[PDB]
Design a protein around this ligand. Structure first.
Ligand SMILES: Cc1cc2nc3c(=O)[nH]c(=O)nc-3n(C[C@H](O)[C@H](O)[C@H](O)COP(=O)(O)OP(=O)(O)OC[C@H]3O[C@@H](n4cnc5c(N)ncnc54)[C@H](O)[C@@H]3O)c2cc1C
Ligand SMILES: *[C@@H]1O[C@H](CO)[C@@H](O[C@@H]2O[C@H](CO)[C@@H](O[C@@H]3O[C@H](CO[C@H]4O[C@H](CO)[C@@H](O)[C@H](O)[C@@H]4O)[C@@H](O)[C@H](O)[C@@H]3O)[C@H](O)[C@H]2NC(C)=O)[C@H](O)[C@H]1NC(C)=O
Ligand SMILES: *[C@@H]1O[C@H](CO)[C@@H](O)[C@H](O)[C@H]1NC(C)=O
Ligand SMILES: *[C@@H]1O[C@H](CO)[C@@H](O)[C@H](O)[C@H]1NC(C)=O
Ligand SMILES: *[C@@H]1O[C@H](CO)[C@@H](O)[C@H](O)[C@H]1NC(C)=O
Length: 581
């Protein structure tokens, strides 16, 4: 089976040459490996820290066991710095194994607002990265199933024109085999009372209001992790090799002629027991947004003000590890009546005004007047290096909000015996960083600082969104089932105002684990690390292709984006292969 095919001994590859080395066998890594190896003459080696997990059992395969895997060997559990918002360390869940974070995630399959992806071309100068182009790739990756009568009656709506049916990633309604909870329709009715839409297909381009959604699972409900979807069908390809249990530590650079060329990687599990393997064509970094930037830094590709004090020679000076964009999540949970019983998830994608309610005018005043101050402050905190280019990102967000009314927050509802919202401000203005703190890759000593709540509007937005989830949990049809709040519950007066919520929130949140931007795809002069083909600036035969690369957040779950971008980048790669045969 697949297990017997996987390599575990470094000696099997040490000193050898393949066409492409992919660091990280996660979402993008395996999708790309599969696409590239469709040409039998193209050799690919995937190097993954973890191992195969897809047949472990429900802790991986059942999405309703979400979270049980946290803390295990399948969770990197990356620790943040001591955060300035609350003087505590936070844990960033991140999948360790073939499939990466697809092994541990919530399976939610939704797309951004069209204006967000369009702006990657029109504001960030990434030619051809507009909604229509990327959506073509997303449709191609997708193998969606329409809902049945029961799933529709629960609240599903599926636009046949917005889903591919013949692709690779299996997606369809979550259905545990219970009856569906009326709470999902109750939430729809409550927001409909306030003029908010419902049942909009969150895969069509306008994610707004309260809807259900597909999940990344097979019809039989097995998790469609990236390994199950892209590796398991294809592992018998002799041109596709996968080494497990090893970390890529750095990219090997040959400094001929005017520019450095990536010629391979070093890999291992501890200093002093490493090996090299070489790439004839390219090295491709896909170790995740927390990790691929550090791999560049260990290699001498990063900021001189970071690398030099650590004793690393800066071979290419780039703002690697800046522009880190993760969201904050908080919880509102209530007990329900017995009549609320049943399965179901849904989410409110809430606009800026829906989020802020009566604070709207004031929040808009901040958005209109403080952008330059905020960018200056974020730059002074080391979240970004160029104030002008950050101000552009911020004017972009304010264009999204004011001229396109994009979803600003997400109130994610779970049912199955409670009414529980996990709530996050989708569009943080804060910018953080990740940087190495030692030169030994295998020590894994790094400062990952998302700078949660260090921008005032992010704290105000989060507070308003979480307050709104309490509000909506006991409004309209929701009052049919509401049987008392259990979180915050006694920890925060039920009549708390917005200031009281801003005081509570820094002590009651978690990372959302949606971190992007650490090797941003945008022009070099805007602070970018890669071009519109994901090539690292000033290095030949080196790409960063994973969640490090999106220059902005999106009002979406990211899988749809990341499978699309993997395939799009894979075409660019294959075009270069065909050009230099
Ligand atoms: C808890 C959680 C819940 C989520 N929920 C959802 C959801 O409901 N919907 C949705 O769309 N998205 C969700 N996501 C996001 C999505 O899962 C990730 O954004 C996506 O998997 C990232 O793709 P990637 O290829 O960038 O990195 P990953 O998929 O993280 O892959 C990176 C891979 O590299 C490996 N690795 C790390 N360091 C090294 C190294 N030095 N050498 C070799 N290999 C290395 C890792 O072990 C991992 O396998 C969630 C994420 C998390 C953590
Ligand atoms: C996380 O922990 C931090 C400490 O590790 C907290 O920071 C400290 O917070 C206290 C208040 O709780 C501040 O103390 C005040 O200091 C000012 C004057 O500050 C100025 O003078 C000193 C003297 O050299 C200088 O260090 C400062 O930078 C200022 O220039 C007094 O006027 C106050 O009455 C009070 O004493 C600390 O200054 C501050 N920083 C430290 C100790 O380095 C921080 O608030 C904690 N964060 C959270 C969310 O809890
Ligand atoms: C279905 O998708 C098509 C094509 O994008 C779009 O034209 C139409 O408005 C959608 N209808 C609904 C109700 O989503
Ligand atoms: C949002 O609220 C402001 C008032 O605070 C109003 O000027 C604006 O038109 C509203 N925007 C939308 C998209 O409804
Ligand atoms: C800073 O950003 C602006 C906007 O992108 C750009 O015009 C300028 O070239 C950048 N500064 C540097 C030093 O490149």
């Amino acid at each position: 089976g697949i297990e017997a095919s996987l390599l575990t001994d470094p000696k099997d590859v040490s000193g050898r040459t393949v066409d492409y080395i992919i660091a990280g066998g996660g979402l993008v890594g395996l999708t790309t490996a599969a696409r590239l190896t469709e040409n039998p003459n193209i050799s690919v080696l995937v190097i993954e820290s973890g191992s195969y997990e897809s047949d472990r059992g429900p802790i991986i395969e059942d999405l309703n066991a979400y979270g049980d895997i946290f803390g295990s060997s399948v969770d990197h559990a990356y620790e943040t710095v001591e955060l300035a918002t609350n003087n505590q360390t936070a844990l960033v869940r991140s999948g360790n194994g073939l499939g990466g974070s697809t092994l541990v995630n919530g399976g939610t399959w939704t797309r951004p607002h069209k204006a967000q992806v369009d702006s990657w071309e029109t504001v960030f100068g990434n030619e051809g990265w507009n909604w229509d182009n990327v959506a073509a790739y997303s449709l191609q990756a997708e193998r969606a199933r329409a809902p049945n009568a029961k799933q529709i009656a629960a609240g599903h709506y599926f636009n046949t024109s917005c889903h591919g049916v013949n692709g690779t990633v299996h997606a369809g309604p979550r259905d545990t085999g219970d009856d569906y909870s009326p709470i999902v329709k109750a939430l729809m009715s409550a927001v409909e009372d306030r003029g908010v839409p419902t049942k909009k297909d969150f895969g069509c381009g306008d994610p707004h209001g309260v809807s259900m959604f597909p999940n990344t699972l097979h019809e039989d409900q097995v998790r469609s992790d990236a390994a199950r979807e892209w590796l398991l069908p294809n592992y018998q390809r002799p041109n596709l090799q996968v080494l497990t249990g090893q970390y890529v530590g750095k990219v090997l650079l040959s400094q001929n002629g005017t520019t450095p060329r990536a010629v391979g990687v070093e890999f291992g599990t501890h200093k002093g027991n490493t090996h090299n393997v070489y790439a004839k064509h390219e090295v491709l970094l896909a170790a995740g947004s927390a990790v691929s930037p550090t791999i560049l830094e260990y290699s001498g590709i990063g900021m001189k003000s970071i690398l030099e004090p650590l004793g690393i020679d800066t071979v290419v000076d780039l703002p690697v590890g800046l522009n880190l964009q993760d969201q904050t999540t908080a919880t509102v949970r209530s007990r329900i009546t017995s009549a609320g019983a049943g399965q179901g998830q849904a989410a409110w994608f809430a606009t800026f005004n829906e989020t802020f309610g009566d604070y709207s005018e004031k929040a808009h005043e901040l958005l209109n007047t403080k952008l330059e101050q905020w960018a200056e402050e974020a730059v002074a905190r080391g979240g970004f290096h160029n104030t002008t280019a950050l101000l552009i990102q911020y004017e972009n967000y304010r264009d999204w909000i004011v001229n396109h009314n994009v979803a600003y927050s997400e109130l994610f509802l779970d049912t199955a015996g409670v009414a529980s919202f996990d709530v996050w401000d989708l569009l943080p203005f804060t910018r953080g960083y990740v940087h190495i703190l030692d030169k030994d890759p295998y020590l894994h000593h790094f400062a990952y600082d998302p700078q949660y709540f260090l921008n005032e509007l992010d704290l105000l937005g989060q507070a308003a969104a979480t307050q709104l989830a309490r509000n909506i949990s006991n409004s309209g049809a929701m009052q049919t089932y509401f049987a008392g709040e259990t979180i915050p519950g006694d920890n925060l007066a039920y009549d708390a105002d917005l200031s009281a919520w801003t005081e509570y929130i820094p002590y009651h949140f978690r990372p959302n684990y949606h971190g992007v931007g650490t090797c941003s795809m945008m022009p070099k002069e805007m602070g970018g690390v890669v071009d519109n083909a994901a090539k690292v600036y000033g290095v030949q035969g080196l790409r960063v292709i994973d969640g490090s690369i999106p220059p902005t957040q999106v009002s979406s779950h990211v899988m749809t984006v990341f499978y699309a971008m993997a395939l799009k980048i894979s075409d660019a790669i294959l075009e270069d292969y065909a050009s230099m045969q």
